[PDB]
Each structure stands twice: as C-alpha cells, then as structure tokens.
Amino acid sequence: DTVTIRTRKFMTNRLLQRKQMVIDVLHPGKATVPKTEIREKLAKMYKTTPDVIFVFGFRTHFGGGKTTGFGMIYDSLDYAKKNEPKHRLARHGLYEKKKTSRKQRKERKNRMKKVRGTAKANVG
Amino acid sequence: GSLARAGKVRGQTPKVAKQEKKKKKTGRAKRRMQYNRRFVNVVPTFGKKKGPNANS
Amino acid sequence: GKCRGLRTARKLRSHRRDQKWHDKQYKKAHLGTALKANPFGGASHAKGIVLEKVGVEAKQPNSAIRKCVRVQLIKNGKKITAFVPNDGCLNFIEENDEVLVAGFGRKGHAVGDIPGVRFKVVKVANVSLLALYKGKKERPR
Amino acid sequence: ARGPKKHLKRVAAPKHWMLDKLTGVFAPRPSTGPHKLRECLPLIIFLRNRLKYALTGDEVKKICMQRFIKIDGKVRTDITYPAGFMDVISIDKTGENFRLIYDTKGRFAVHRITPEEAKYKLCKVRKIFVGTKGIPHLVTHDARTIRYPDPLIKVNDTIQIDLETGKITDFIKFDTGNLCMVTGGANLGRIGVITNRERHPGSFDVVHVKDANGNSFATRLSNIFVIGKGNKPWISLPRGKGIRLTIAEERDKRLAAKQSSG
Amino acid sequence: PVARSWVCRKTYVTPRRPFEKSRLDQELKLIGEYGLRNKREVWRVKFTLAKIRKAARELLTLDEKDPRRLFEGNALLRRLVRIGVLDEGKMKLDYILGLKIEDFLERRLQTQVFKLGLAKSIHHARVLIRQRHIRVRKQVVNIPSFIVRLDSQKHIDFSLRSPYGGGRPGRVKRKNAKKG
Amino acid sequence: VRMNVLADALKSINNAEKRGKRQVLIRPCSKVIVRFLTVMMKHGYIGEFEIIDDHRAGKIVVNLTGRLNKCGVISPRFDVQLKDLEKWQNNLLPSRQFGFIVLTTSAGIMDHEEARRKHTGGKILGFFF
RNA sequence: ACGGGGAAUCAGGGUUCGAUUCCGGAGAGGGAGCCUGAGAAACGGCUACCACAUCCAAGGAAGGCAGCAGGCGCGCAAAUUACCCACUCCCGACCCGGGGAGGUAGUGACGAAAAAUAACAAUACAGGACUCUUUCGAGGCCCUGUAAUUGGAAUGAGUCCACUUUAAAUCCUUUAACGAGGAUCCAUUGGAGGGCAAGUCUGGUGCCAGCAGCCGCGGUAAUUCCAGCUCCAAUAGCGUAUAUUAAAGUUGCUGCAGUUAAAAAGCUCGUAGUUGGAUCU
C-alpha cells in the first residue's frame, strides 16, 4: 500500500552544515518512488521543510522490493546553495547552467586568441 | 582440361523443393527430447543396438 | 651418451640450440627464407586480381579437372594459382575481378589431388563464394 | 621524463590508501611536504575515503577552504597535503582530534585522540648537526628543524614536540627495552619492545622487536620509531595494540564476534 | 588509460575428444536429469568441481600442520558445507576428492524448486524461475543456476507478486476473464 | 676411470638383487656408501652388512634380503630444497606409500621423510624402493 | 627486437607471446643546433638544412594528428569530424576558470559472464511392467511419444507511459497498458565411409561434375559428388585460413636416438671444457 522510508547510514556533517544519509524506500507494488515525494516524506520524518532536502542516486533492486538512494538535509537553504552541486540545485530550479555548447565556447576562445586588446570582446 | 563443364551436375540436378514441417524444438526442450528418446524407454531398441537413422 | 654434470648447463643449452636447427619446423619458422618466399608474406588471406581461369589435372590415381584461377596478389604482385572450391563456382568468377584467397589448409602444402595448388578462393568481388553458391547473394553489378 | 611528474595513476598509488580500481584513472597525487609520497595519507583520502564527510573531491575542497582542518595545529587548505605518521588532524568545528597512526595491516587507522593529547606529537630525529656558529640543529622524520636540542638527543631517538611552540618537551633514547613501532616493511604497524640491535657497518642495521604477546620480528633500523620508555607508550594506541594476529586467529576472532553480536 | 577493469575468465572447459560416445551419453543423462539447456552448463559445473579438486590436491600435498593448509582447507570445506554439497560430518580435505558433479547440480535453484514441490517437473522449475515466480527469502531470484546455500534452502517461496503466490492474475487469465 | 663409487655400489647391489643372490661384495667402500647402506638398513631393505678392512680402502659384504626392487644413484648430486622434494618424490618414487629418496644434508645422510622432519634440504644422493 | 610487471598453454619439466591502458626508456617527418626556464637539446617552442606540402597580387608568408574525432593511402586486418567537466584527478593568481587527460553515450558477434525460443494437464495412439491370472489379456495403480488433438494457465521479446538513472540523456532496475497455438514471436552452422557421433534410404550424375585436412569416393546398384528425407554435433553460435601451445619422449634437463630403420669422426695424440678413488670425531 503505502511507501515506507528508512535512513540507514545517518551522519551529521557539521563541516558541510547538513545531515547525510542512505535512504531505503519500500514500495512493493509501485514504480520507483519519485524524488519529490521522497523529499516530503523525509521532511515529515526529520521535522523540516522540503526545500533543504536533496535526494539522488536511487537504485531499485531487482524484483521491485526497495530502492536505495542517498540524501542530504541542509541546516538552511543558503547552506544548501553553498555546499550543493550545481546540477542538484538545478534539479530544484535553484540554478541555471549556461546555454552554450563546449564547441561554441572553444571556438570563441580560439577566435579571441587571434585578436589583441579590447577587440577581443568584439568577437563571439 | 576444358572448363566448359563447370556447373554440370548441379545444373542438371532435378530441383526438388524442401517440404514444410513444423519447427524443431530449440534449447532446453530439444535436449529434453533427445534425453527422452535415448534414455527413458526401450521401445526403439531391439537388443541389437540399432542406429538412430537406420533405414533398414 | 649425454653429459650429466653440474657445470654442463652451457654445453647442454648450446647443443640443444644447435640441434633445434635440424628440426624442419623450427628451421622453417626461424630462418626467414620461408617467410620471404611465402606469397602471402606471412598473412592468412590475400586479395588478388584474376588473370585467367585454368583447369589443373588431378593427380594420377584420380581423373578430374579442378577449376582454379591465376591471381596476382595486390600486396606484392606475385602470381599464384587458387582453387575455386565448389561446383559451378568458377562460373561466379569473371576475368580481372578481385578475389580474396586463403590457404588450402596444409600450410604451404598441396592438398589432395590438386598438384602444386596451395590456395583457395574465398571471396570474389567482395562477396563470399559460399553466399553466391547458396543463392544468398548475387554478383555485384 | 623532462621535469617532475604531477600525476599519480590510481593503480600506482600506495596500496594502504585502499583506493578502488573503477573510481577513476587517477589517485590524488600528494603534494610535496613533510612526509614521503608512499608513506603519507593525503587530506582528501582522510576526509573522503576514511571519515566520509565528503562524497566527492569537490566536497573535500569545500571542507578544507572553510579552514576547518588543522594538521599539527596549522590550518591546511591543500586537499592533497601529505599527512603522515604521528600527525595530529584536528577538526574544531566537529570537535575531534585524530592521530595518523599505523594499523597492524600497515594502513593509517582512524584513531581518535583527546584534546589534551592533540597538543603534542612524537618525532623521530633523522639527523643532528652543528651549524651556523656552533648551534646544534636536529632534523626530524617530518622535516621539522629544531635548534638547540638537548645534547643527549641523538639520531634514532624520539622527541615529544609541543605542537603550539614546536619545541622539545621530553625525549626517549633508542635503546633495548624501549617500546617502538615499525614504520616500514613487512612488519609495518606492529608495536613491541626492542630486544637487540645488530649493527652492520657500511650497511643497514637490523633491530629485533618482541611483541607484547611474545612474538618476535625484525626490521631495518630506519623502520623503527621509539614509542615509549620501557613498555608504556607515550601516545594512545589503536584498537589493536600493535599485536598483529595470524589469519587463523583473526578469522576465529571475527567468527566469535559475529556469534556474540548478531 | 581507462577506469574499466578487464578482469574476466571462462567458466567452462571444452572436452578434448569431441565425439566420445560414453561422454556424450553421460552429459546427456545429466542434462535430462537436471533439465539443463546445453552441454556448456555440464562443462561449467565440471570446471568448478575440477578447480575445487585441484585446490584440494594442492592443499593435500602440503604438510598437515602447515598454517596455509589449515586456513585454506578450512575455508574450502566451510564453503562446500555452506552450499550443501559437502556434509558437515565429512569435513576432511580428502573428502573433497570424492565429490561428484551431481552434488553441485542438486544445489541449483532449478533442482531445489523442483524438489520442494513448487514445480511439477524440472523443466517447469526452469520456466518458473525464468518467469520470476520463485523468490529466495525476500529476493526474487531469476537465475536457474543460482546455487542455494543450506541456510537459504528453507526460504524458497512462490513470490508475493506471482499469480501462484501473490494472487494478481496474469495477462492470460485477465484477458480470458474479460471475455467471460 | 672410476667415479661415483656410490653409483658402482648401488649398481652392484641392484644387479645382485636382480640375480636373487643373498650377498653382494662392494668395493671400494666409503663413508657415503656406509651411510647410504645404514639408511637402507633402518628401513629393512638390505639387512646387516660387514666392512672388510684392507689397508687401502674398505670392502662391504652386504647380506641381501629380497625386499629391494631398485636402488639407484642420482648423478650429479643436485641440490634439493624442501619445495622441490615433492617433485623429486613424484619423479623417482613408485608410490607415496613407500620408497625413499636419500639426501645428504648438513644434519647427515637421511631419507626424504627425515629431511622434512628436520626441515632441511640438501643434495640428492639416490633412491631405493 | 622497446625492456619489465605480465599472457596463452602447461602432470612434472617446459614452449611460445608480451605494439597494447601499470613502471622504466625512446621519439614527435628525418637529422642537427638552441632560447627560456628549477626542470627541455621541448617540437600543440624557436632556428637551419633534407623530404613533402599550403597561400600569394610572385614581392613574400606560413607548416608538422606516433593528441581526440575525422579523411587518404596501405592492406586480411581495426569505431563518432557526438555530449560533459557531474566523477577521477591535474594546472593556475585561484572554494569560482580550464582540461578530446578523463568521464558519457555512438559503432562493436575481439572476447568474457548470465540467459529465452516454451511449461502443464486431460484425449486417445506406438507405447512399457517391481501392477496381476497362467505366457494368453485388463492396460486413468509407476512414465515417454503420434499430435495440421483439445484445453486453459504462465511469461518475456517487442511497442508504449510514468518514475528512477544521468552534467542533459541512453541502458539496466521499477510500475502500469497492449503483447503467444503453425505460441508463423518459425535457430543456426557444419556434417552422416573410417579417423569421428550420425543412413550401404530415395532421385540425379557416371573417373564427368565434384567431394576429400589424411586414407580415399566417383568409370550405370555412389553409405563419400548434386539434391529430397531422416539423422547428430555444438548451439546464439558455428565453419574456414594463418600463427602458435599441448599432443611431440617427433629437440628428449626430467626424457629420445646413432649394428641393420637417419646416424660413431679412418685412427690416435692433445689444450681449453666437462668429470674425477679411500681417508681426518
């Protein structure tokens, strides 16, 4: 019926101002439980708001019994925006990466290498 | 030493079309069938140990 | 008899090393004359251009015309005679087409009736002789 | 070839780091520093692979640039800083002190120490020499140059160094009957009492060391590090007390512990 | 340079004589009795048995009181009695040499779910395991060559999602019941 | 000329045992020959023997009990470590239930089993079974 | 012929391989000479010559993929002009920038691991036998096979959602929907004289065509060509060529031979080499 959540390997990382844990999601007859509701279950279980919880790396076991992932719960949203990888912040819509490919940037740099002075900014 | 006859016998062989038969079993079922034919009953033997493809 | 002494290691090893040269296989594989005289140059296969179709007469006990082809290897321009294995397979070959030729299975030795033929045609015009033989593929146009 | 190398392959790294083989091609190349490349624990290995405060090297860098880690009382921000034998790693933010010590398997154990024992360390003096207008200088295994040491202190002795001032508090002579640890070779990490040093002029001296369980072994003189006067160590020891167990004894202990634990 | 590991090994050995009639009959008897797919499974179990026997011989050539003999012989015998091939009362190194291939073939999951009455035959056992109807403890096991340990024998159930152990009708039952 | 007097002694013993004789004369004798014969005797393979003292080099009359299949020398005297002893046993001995390889070690001349018991290698002198 | 760690094979001994991700060396088209620098005789630095080659307005200028992709060429013989700095680490003045190192996907039957192509019941049929009388027969009381017999059960290949994965992604895993009776959702590659397992069945050809590693088969009844049928060998694999290992005690140290099968020098002497009698508690 309902989805169960357990936290195996819990530690309080005061160095990174967070709590890090391994999350076991018991969901016998459901698809891999979405991260957005794993976050709210963790928020209820640890008495905090669900915007400081970053869950990732969820792997369902063969047969469909349980899913194992990792999770962080930060002391504040600012410490999350400080100590979290940019992609995991972007998963929460807290960060946007540049809209340029590696090719575009590399050829832009090599084109700028051929000009000297303020004219470098005139080529893109 | 003439090369004029090169596809003589294959060319002049009366062409026969292969029949249509139900598919053979594959994998474990074929081995099960072989084991059944060779070890389960003594119906296909005579005490003379005849061969699987005996046309006699 | 042989020398059995605690200090005869050098003599024994030298004798073995000299006597290995009297083994035909060792001398063949360690002189370089066989490698330099091998038409394939040490390869397993070689591509060549058919120069003509020939009919080689089987050895004396048997009586047949084995269809072979004279092919000049692209790698070194050497002319060899390659057997066309199956029946009607010489019809699949045309003059001045490219054939992939392998050995005959006996490592530079003639095989069976065919005298002096140590190569067989494997592909003609980038299509295997077996695929043409069974109708799986047709000659490129 | 030309100039120094700057990389270290994962499989060419010291085996006591217990690194994987599938987690990348490279291992953290330790920076130049007090300890050798193959006898050190880089700060990233300690803070990520051992203590697991970080999951990636970027998190190790984040931890270190907040100035949370001190080696021998000095804040280190180099995540590849070579930390080696007897170094004190202090994290005031989480309030814990460790001493980089060897385990009987020859690996740097995670050995927690008290705040009172984090105030000092032990250093084996590597050389003593008179220089610069007659001042005696002493060089230690961690490249710490101390001027005006006690005239009794000689090479292969151990000195207790106060980490705040870097000055000698006390010293243990290299002598038979003194407790010591093995810092290299097959017997690395074992702790015992010195019984006999047999000298080889022009070659390596060999020192024989007897365990606290009666077992005896030998090492080269360079691999001995005097730990205490007599049999009492001047520093705290790991869960194992330097007594290396055989594979049979270790298997029996593991089986009994699992039987009595769960 | 890549982080990839190239470590692999062949888990079987091809026989030297390809057309030995006695060997063919023996392998076919094993295949039919234990419901194996091809000769390669027989050769695989043979290779495992041969490697175990070679290790046992190498340990037996050692001095009895040699510590490596004690340690590795104890480990090997412990593993053999752990997987049920070796009886706990027969725990000597020279008792390893007396093991057969059928001893290891009996411990397969296919043979076990046939013996425990879960399947009507050994081929039904294979198709049951391959179709995810069998679980070992809480884990749905899908491999028929899965070698069952002694402590795992008592937990071979019929799964909690299988139509035979969990009561969700399959595709065919539901489709037929729709027309009814 | 004559070399390896132990080889000649063992050849004489072997040829006399093949012929069914109850005694064999070995000449010249030596310390190695006497030690080998004693090792042979303690295992019951030859029985008692007598050393005739001529004032240049000894002779030995060995009583023969027909329990000896083959006595042989290993020339040259290969130096054998404890690891290679099993390979030498497999090569030279008819079975693992009987047969002895004789080695000269720093502890004396003895069979391979006694060499393993004393934990020593040596140089292989020969074998008997 | 880059060396080694090492690889294949291997009863014991050995034989062969090691360009190839780790360590060490060497080189950057071939030579040579240098600047800078802690470190280079550096080549994604410079200077020449030699070879090749690009642009030119003919005055000059500019080159170095044995980096990553990608072409040409060579050949029997080897993949994308893709995405990313999320991992691993490296570099910098640097918590922030950059990295074709590296990671990720694409092509991939190099190889290695697991593993489908059906399972089960009733129906009778060729059916057996410790079932029983009395061999004769009853044969759902102990199991195979005719199956274009019947019957429902099961399931994944596939298609398609939603998660999960991950730096976007893909794949695997998970969930739901559809998805199997020629379950046509149709297994192949070689063979059937011996070696060596499996037909002197039928038709065709007639020393031809061909087969055949070897021995041999084929000249009008071919167990061997060409086919059909049947059969067996391995099986998502199998055949072929070459090289190599075992077989090879046919290189023999273990462990071979030398009267006649291949072989003791015509005969002595003789230095190096190899080997060398007893004896000392």
Offer a concise description of the structure.
Chain A is of the alpha+beta class. Helices cover 29% and strands 27% of the residues of chain A.
Oligomer: part of a larger assembly
CA gyration radius of chain C, whole angstroms: 21 Å
Largest interface: A-D, 9 and 14 residues
Q: Count of DSSP E strands of chain B? A: 0
Strand numbers in spatial order across the main sheet of chain C = 1-2-3-5-4
Percent of sequence in beta strands of chain B: under 5%
- Helix-strand string of chain B: HH
Strand content of chain C: 25-35%
The shape of chain C, in one word, is elongated
* Cα-to-Cα separation, first versus last residue of chain C: 71 Å
Whole-angstrom Rg of chain B: 20 Å
Specify the number of helices of chain C.
4
GO cellular component, one term (chain E): ribosome
Subcellular location (chain E): Cytoplasm; Nucleus, Nucleolus
Subunit structure (chain E): Component of the small ribosomal subunit. Identified in a IGF2BP1-dependent mRNP granule complex containing untranslated mRNAs. Part of the small subunit (SSU) processome, composed of more than 70 proteins and the RNA chaperone small nucleolar RNA (snoRNA) U3.
Keywords (chain E): Acetylation, Cytoplasm, Isopeptide bond, Nucleus, Phosphoprotein, Ribonucleoprotein, Ribosomal protein, RNA-binding, rRNA-binding, Ubl conjugation
Describe the protein's architecture and organization.
- Chain E: This is Small ribosomal subunit protein uS4.
- Helices cover 30% and strands 0% of the residues of chain B.
- With 56 residues, chain B is mainly alpha-helical.
- The radius of gyration of chain B is 20 Å and the shape is elongated.
- Chain B starts with 7 loop residues before the first helix and ends in a 17-residue tail after the last helix.
- With 180 residues, chain E is mostly helical.
- Chain E has one domain.
- Helices cover 48% and strands 3% of the residues of chain E.
- A 3-stranded antiparallel beta sheet of chain E has the order 2-1-3, with no helix packed on it.
- Chain F is built from 4 helices and 8 strands, in the order H-E-H-E-E-E-E-H-E-E-H-E.
- In chain F, the strands form 2 sheets. In chain F, strands 4, 5, 6, 7 and 8 form a 5-stranded antiparallel beta sheet that branches. A 3-stranded antiparallel beta sheet of chain F has the order 1-3-2.
- Chain F is globular.
- In chain F, 28% of the residues are buried.
- At the A-D interface, loops of A face helix 2 of D.
- Chain C binds one RNA strand of 281 nucleotides through helix 1, helix 2, strand 1, strand 2 and strand 4.
Descriptive labels:
part of a larger assembly; 6 chains; C: 141 residues; alpha+beta; 4 helices; D: 262 residues; mainly beta; Structural Genomics Hypothetical 15.5 Kd Protein In mrcA-pckA Intergenic Region, Chain A; OB fold (Dihydrolipoamide Acetyltransferase, E2P); SH3 type barrels; 3 domains; 3 helices; 19 strands; RNA-binding; ribosome; 40S; Nsp1; betacoronaviruses
